Specification:
The structure is a homodimer. Chain A is of the alpha+beta class. Chain A has a domain of 101 residues: main proteinase (3clpro) structure, domain 3 (Orthogonal Bundle), CATH 1.10.1840.10. The first copy, chain A, is built from eight helices and 13 strands. In chain A, the strands form two sheets. In chain A, strands 5-4-1-2-3-7-6 form a seven-stranded antiparallel sheet, with no helix packed on it. In chain A, strands 8, 9, 10, 11, 12 and 13 form a six-stranded mixed sheet that branches. In chain A, strand 6 and strand 7 form a beta hairpin. Chain A is elongated and about 70 Å long. Chains A and B meet through helix 1, strand 9, strand 10 and helix 8 of A and helix 1, strand 9, strand 10 and helix 8 of B. Bound molecules: the ligand *[C@H](O)[C@H](CC(C)C)NC(=O)[C@H](CC(C)C)NC(=O)[C@H](CC(C)C)NC(=O)OCc1ccccc1 (2 copies), chloride ion (CL) and sodium ion.
Chain lengths: 302, 305
């Protein structure tokens, strides 16, 4: 029993982290096979942070302008290419620690683990979610760019996030590993802001099911709701719409607990109206929205 | 910026986890040098787990009774012994992935990372605190026994916890790597219960400093207090006493934020007596007590391993 914010074991990713320096800028890169992936803004100077022409900057670089360090070994860059906002440095040695891996672009509400790194070395691992406004609420300092987010269902590492920037509210933006930003953001220091964030309703419901599985029932009630009535209420609390896809997705947890999805929706309605009145759910005094239905099943059943 | 519950990178420990099978029980072992450590109750039975004589149960055991698997490779057991509640299986091969490590026993209020494993395969990592009642609030399913907790200090892994059991409230109990239980617990399926728990005051203060470092300042106030005065309030609300050593340990965060510990204690004193008035701190509506002062400094300064 028990329920924790759990990250994937980070060792398979640790073995891929390197340090990339261009000019006076150092950040992290991801070394897979004979390619190092990193944010393309490593090639910016203090002068072109607002409107960098990355194509023009990169054509001026020699391979020896990129210093790549894997632990105590310098890697030799033998070519480079830009893919959207990611730089791909070809090196003369394949990473012997390359795991089985793939690249996946995720949807809002999905969770993943982040291995926060500085100078190619890991500082720690934590769990994040892609917020509906396409930011993540990370923990990142100067030099953290190139840190990645990943999942490891089974024995294959799915890389889904590379860190690029921090926005004014202290939240974070980045790309998939094909270099496409999540959300409308750009790798320029022109004024940008995250949209109003909202709560990931389907994840809250998954977590309420986790609470029931772990033996807590105090928030249940005798009522049900229609889906449309639920969404009309939840939208008043800046909750995301619940779709029929989400209802289908919650079917298994519904079957395991004997609580119909729309009955659990009426519980959430009451919690939004009343709060917790001094009680907690799974050790929290707020409704938690960074566990997915898949996460709950994985942690509760295995 | 940002502040998350952050575990240590787990790679060094993942290379040490193996599967141990005895009879019909399978759980996890920790393979370091030429020894595999695991809970001694791996040798118990469906018909033998209420009042076990471990001493006598182990002599009937022999080496090939213990099936140890490192990934898809069997390790040959060449000896076995018991130390307190931990079994030590000597194997014929030293683990080539053994990190720099030591065994340590931690104090209540200290935090560590748990690498949750099943069938010898790491499945997840999360951060925990040794509660003042010597339980941990973990997440463990059947087959998780032998999962370990650890810290990393520079390049050295300090192993501090091995998982043995779950108590009726859904909290967890285990041993150090020398087999001594944390808390007044025994590896028997006899009636046991977690004692009443308390809140780890020095950790709450550290987390308030983390909040200030991240721009959450509403709870700061003009007042200061004394160690004596605050500790009476703490006692009243089931908070652990604040010692002078705690005050000194927070000193760095005190110097960097401008908020003396007794200045911050006055903030905490008011949060206890009055609550949070509907507000949140670092995204929580509760006072968080599973970050140590060291954890806050590490995360906010970007220490690496
Ligand atoms: C890479 O290590 C670093 C990580 C941060 C977490 C510090 N990223 C950057 O420095 C990044 C480089 C640019 C070219 C993508 N810049 C930012 O993230 C920057 C904040 C820094 C300077 C602390 N953010 C930014 O420019 O956001 C756009 C913006 C500009 C002006 C007003 C509002 C928003
Ligand atoms: C090892 O994988 C497993 C971990 C659990 C989290 C499943 N440990 C055990 O099965 C363990 C073995 C005993 C000899 C220490 N037993 C328990 O943890 C057991 C709960 C199981 C059956 C889920 N708990 C227990 O014995 O607690 C004391 C108790 C017993 C009966 C009544 C009150 C209290
Ligand atoms: Cl005063
Ligand atoms: Na004060």
């Amino acid at each position: 029993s028990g329920f924790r914010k759990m990250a994937f074991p980070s060792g398979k990713v640790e073995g891929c982290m390197v340090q990339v320096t261009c000019g006076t800028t150092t950040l992290n890169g991801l070394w897979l096979d004979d390619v190092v992936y990193c944010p393309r803004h490593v090639i910016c100077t203090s002068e072109d942070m607002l409107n960098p022409n990355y194509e023009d900057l990169l054509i001026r670089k020699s391979n020896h302008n990129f210093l790549v360090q894997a632990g105590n070994v310098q890697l030799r860059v033998i070519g480079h290419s830009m893919q959207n906002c990611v730089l791909k440095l070809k090196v003369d040695t394949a990473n012997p620690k390359t795991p089985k891996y793939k690249f996946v672009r995720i949807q809002p509400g999905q969770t993943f683990s982040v291995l926060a790194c500085y100078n190619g070395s890991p500082s720690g691992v934590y769990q994040c979610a892609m917020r509906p406004n396409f930011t993540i609420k990370g923990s990142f300092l100067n030099g953290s760019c190139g840190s990645v987010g990943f999942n490891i269902d089974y024995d294959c590492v799915s890389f889904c996030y590379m860190h690029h920037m921090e926005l004014p509210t202290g939240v974070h933006a980045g790309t998939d590993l094909e270099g496409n930003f999540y959300g409308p953001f750009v790798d320029r220091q022109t004024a940008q802001a995250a949209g109003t964030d909202t709560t990931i309703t389907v994840n809250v419901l998954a977590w309420l099911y986790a609470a029931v599985i772990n033996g807590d029932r105090w928030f249940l009630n005798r009522f049900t709701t229609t889906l449309n009535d639920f969404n009309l209420v939840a939208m008043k609390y800046n909750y995301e719409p619940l779709t029929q896809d989400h209802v289908d997705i919650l079917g298994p947890l519904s079957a395991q607990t004997g609580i119909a999805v729309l009955d659990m929706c009426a519980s959430l309605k009451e919690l939004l109206q009343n709060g917790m009145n001094g009680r907690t759910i799974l050790g929290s005094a707020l409704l938690e929205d960074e566990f997915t239905p898949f996460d709950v099943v994985r942690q509760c059943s295995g």
